[PDB]
Amino acid sequence: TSRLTVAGSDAKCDFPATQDSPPVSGSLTLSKGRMTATFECSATQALSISTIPTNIEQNVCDPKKTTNGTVCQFGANGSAGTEVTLKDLLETDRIVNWKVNEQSQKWSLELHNEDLPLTDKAFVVGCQATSASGKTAACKLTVNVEARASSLAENNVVTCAYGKGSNPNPVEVEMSTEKNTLTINCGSDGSLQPTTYAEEYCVADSKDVNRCSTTRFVEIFPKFLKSWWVTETQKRTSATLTIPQTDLPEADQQFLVGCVPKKTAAPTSCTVLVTVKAHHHHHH
Ligand SMILES: [Zn+2]
Ligand SMILES: [Zn+2]
Ligand SMILES: [Zn+2]
Ligand SMILES: [Zn+2]
Ligand SMILES: [Zn+2]
Ligand SMILES: [Zn+2]
Ligand SMILES: [Zn+2]
Ligand SMILES: [Zn+2]
Cα 163 from chain centre: 7
Q: What is the resolution of this structure in A?
A: 1.9
- 236 with 229: CB under 8 angstroms? no
Q: Check whether 280 is labelled as a binding-site residue.
A: no
How far, in Å, are 96, 112, 124 from residue 93 at the CA level?
9, 12, 21
How far is the centre of ligand 6, averaged over its atoms, from the C-alpha of 249 (Å)? 16
Method: X-ray
Return the C-alpha torsion angle 79, 98, 95, 34, nearest 10. Answer: 100
Name the closest ligand to CA 177.
Answer: 6
How far is the centre of ligand 3, averaged over its atoms, from the C-alpha of 89 (Å)? 8
* Separation of first and last alpha carbons in the chain: 69
Phi, psi of 246 (to 5 degrees): -85, 0
How far is the centre of ligand 6, averaged over its atoms, from the C-alpha of 179 (Å)? 9
Q: How far apart are CA 79 and CA 61, in angstroms?
A: 10
How far is the centre of ligand 4, averaged over its atoms, from the C-alpha of 197 (Å)? 9
Nearest CA among 199, 193, 122, 121 for reference residue 158: 193
Q: How far apart are CA 54 and CA 74, in angstroms?
A: 11
Q: How far apart are CA 42 and CA 10, in angstroms?
A: 14
- 25 with 97: CB under 8 angstroms? no
Q: How far apart are CA 250 and CA 271, in angstroms?
A: 25
Q: Do 121 and 198 reside in the same domain of the chain?
A: no
Q: Check whether 189 is labelled as a binding-site residue.
A: yes
How far is the centre of ligand 2, averaged over its atoms, from the C-alpha of 120 (Å)? 21
Q: Check whether 199 is labelled as a binding-site residue.
A: no
Among candidate residues 99, 127, 148, the one where a domain is terminated: 148
CATH code of residue 93: 2.60.40.1320
How far is the centre of ligand 1, averaged over its atoms, from the C-alpha of 21 (Å)? 40
Neighbours of 254 (CB within 10 A): 16
Q: Do 2 and 132 reside in the same domain of the chain?
A: yes
Name the closest ligand to CA 219.
Answer: 4
Helix (H) or strand (E) holding 5: strand 3-7
Domain that holds residue 5: 1-148
Q: How far apart are CA 28 and CA 89, in angstroms?
A: 17
Q: Is 276 exposed, middle or buried (0-12, 13-18, 19+ CB in 10 A)?
A: buried
Q: Do 105 and 176 reside in the same domain of the chain?
A: no
Q: Check whether 172 is labelled as a binding-site residue.
A: no
Q: Check whether 40 is labelled as a binding-site residue.
A: no
Cβ partners under 8 Å of residue 178, min gap 6: 280, 281, 282, 283
Among candidate residues 148, 178, 194, the one where a domain is terminated: 148
Q: How far apart are CA 172 and CA 152, in angstroms?
A: 8
DSSP assignment letter at 18: S
Q: Do 189 and 119 reside in the same domain of the chain?
A: no
Q: Do 161 and 282 reside in the same domain of the chain?
A: yes
Q: How far apart are CA 192 and CA 176, in angstroms?
A: 22
How far is the centre of ligand 6, averaged over its atoms, from the C-alpha of 227 (Å)? 24
How far is the centre of ligand 4, averaged over its atoms, from the C-alpha of 162 (Å)? 25
How far is the centre of ligand 1, averaged over its atoms, from the C-alpha of 114 (Å)? 6
How far is the centre of ligand 2, averaged over its atoms, from the C-alpha of 187 (Å)? 20
Number of domains present in the structure of the chain: 2
**32 strand-pairing partners:** none
